[PDB]
Design a protein around this ligand. Structure first.
Ligand SMILES: OC[C@H]1O[C@H](O[C@H]2[C@H](O)[C@@H](O)[C@@H](O[C@H]3[C@H](O)[C@@H](O)[C@@H](O)O[C@@H]3CO)O[C@@H]2CO)[C@H](O)[C@@H](O)[C@@H]1O
Length: 490
């Protein structure tokens, strides 16, 4: 995990063209001798602040710009300062995306916006309005298909509809984003989410739907439409689907308003290789042939490099991406953005699944998004601590299945570390009778520091023939507890 000199480790999301990026990397490993590793860990954007607080992680992190103000405020990013000559090569508005407190803190790579993607053979005339979709879906179910499937687990995909009639994240006022003026619970935001939940209520889509099943359903021709970004075009290309990319539908006569992201590359503050990273980025990646290499793996969208974008912009698909982008807004990059996104994620999931009403869900989102910074941090650190031990359960169950002659107290044997950034110690006792605990002692903001979160397993019972269950317990305050953890008792 610690950073090696004379070497570059790069993190980029699994849905981007990382193999293409590794090719720019293997070429770098030719003109310099400097090796390049490209990895795509799960939840890298969450992992990065965890590992880079202790001087670990990649030399270079790729993500949309909205997460980078948080990174910068937390101290984790070197200021990038390119020559004015290099800046002339990228559109000014992309540099604006990656400027925080007047300093640039990442290189902008590409501009992304969601579009309506549709099956031309199945649906030659896609709907201009969201309101058209229930009837269209009814028609399509009769033929054994569906009108629309997209990822309901990430708020990024439902935001264009929430924003259509007036939802907003943070109000921009007197030259700054007002972090206490949140627009996720106004009338327009309410009407947007209501329309989505009505779709689900009336069985035109399924609350369960995630990225993989929507992508699979579309690329196999089972659904006529999906909502996605340019990175998804590659997989459809290898499919038998004749698809188009077009303007998102309107809602109450209003354009859908996607939050537009700028894929960006940050340089780790603890990296020994800030100059090697700067040259890889400026003189290998951000060139026509570097971007082309990444693009032919998975399309980047409208790239920041003027020279290359001139060609790319002749693609009707990229013209559709930019049309949608113009109807939406470039995301803020302020630190409160992740609090906003986590708040809206829960709201959409809870409303869609029927656990809360739309008004209740958005009311709670408004409070969570406008919460004080330590509140968001405390919830995050507790969640992280829990994730740091949850992998231990499954492995514990495999050991119990073989049978134990002695209680197991080695957390390594469960695939766990003895400590993490969120857990000052991780301990375990997997008992011979199944009674067990895997315990995180939490470390971070004073609200949760030295509290415990743990998985508790009851004993199996051989006389009764019963198997013990797992329960998440914590002595953290109730309003800070994650979903499905309760308090402890004795
Ligand atoms: O939902 C919780 C989630 O919120 C935040 O994730 C947001 C991203 O920061 C934001 O950029 C956008 O992510 C999308 C990418 O821009 C796009 O390139 C592609 O990868 O799809 C992404 C969405 O799946 O939207 C998400 C919110 O959905 C936060 O950073 C995450 O840590 C958090 O898990």
């Amino acid at each position: 995990m610690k950073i090696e000199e004379g070497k570059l480790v790069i993190w980029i999301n699994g849905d981007k063209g990382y193999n293409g990026l590794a090719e720019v990397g293997k070429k770098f490993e030719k003109d310099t001798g400097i090796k390049v590793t490209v990895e795509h860990p799960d939840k890298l954007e969450e992992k990065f602040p965890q590992v880079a607080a202790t001087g670990d992680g990649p030399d270079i992190i790729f993500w949309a710009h909205d997460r980078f103000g948080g990174y910068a405020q937390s101290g984790l990013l070197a200021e990038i300062t390119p020559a004015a000559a290099f800046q002339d090569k990228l559109y000014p508005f992309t540099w604006d995306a990656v400027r925080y407190n007047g300093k640039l803190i990442a290189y902008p790579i590409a501009v992304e916006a969601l579009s309506l993607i549709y099956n031309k053979d199945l649906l030659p005339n896609p709907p201009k309005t969201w309101e058209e979709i229930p009837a269209l879906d009814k028609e399509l179910k009769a033929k054994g298909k569906s009108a629309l499937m997209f990822n309901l687990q990430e708020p990024y995909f439902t935001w264009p509809l929430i924003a259509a009639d007036g939802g907003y994240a943070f109000k921009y006022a007197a030259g700054k984003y007002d972090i206490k003026d949140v627009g996720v619970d106004n009338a327009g935001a309410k009407a947007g989410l209501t329309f989505l939940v009505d779709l689900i209520k009336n069985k035109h889509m399924n609350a369960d739907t995630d990225y993989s099943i929507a992508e699979a359903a579309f690329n196999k021709g089972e659904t006529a439409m999906t909502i996605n970004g340019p990175w998804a075009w590659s997989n459809i290309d290898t499919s038998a689907v004749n698809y188009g990319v077009t303007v998102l539908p309107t809602f109450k006569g209003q354009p859908s308003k996607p939050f537009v992201g700028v894929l960006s590359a940050g340089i780790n503050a603890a990296s020994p290789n800030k100059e090697l990273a700067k040259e890889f980025l400026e003189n290998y990646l951000l060139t026509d042939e570097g971007l082309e290499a990444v693009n032919k793996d998975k399309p980047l969208g409208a790239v920041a490099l003027k020279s290359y974008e001139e060609e790319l912009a002749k693609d009707p698909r990229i013209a559709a991406t930019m049309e949608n982008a113009q109807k939406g807004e470039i995301m803020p990059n302020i630190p409160q953005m992740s609090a906003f996104w986590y708040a809206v994620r829960t709201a959409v999931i809870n409303a869609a699944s029927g656990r809360q009403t739309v008004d209740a869900a958005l009311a709670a989102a408004q409070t969570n998004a406008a919460a004080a910074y330590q509140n968001y941090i405390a919830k995050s650190q507790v969640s992280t601590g829990l994730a740091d031990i949850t992998a231990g359960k499954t492995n514990a169950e495999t050991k119990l299945a073989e049978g134990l002659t002695a209680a197991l107290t080695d957390v390594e044997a469960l695939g766990l570390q003895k400590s993490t950034n969120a857990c000052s110690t991780i301990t375990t006792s997997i008992g011979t009778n199944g009674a067990s605990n895997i315990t995180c002692t939490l470390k971070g903001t004073s609200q949760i520091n030295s509290k415990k979160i743990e998985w508790i397993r009851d004993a199996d019972n051989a006389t009764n023939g019963t198997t013990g269950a797992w329960r998440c317990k914590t002595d953290v305050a109730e309003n800070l507890r994650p979903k499905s953890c309760g308090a402890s008792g004795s």
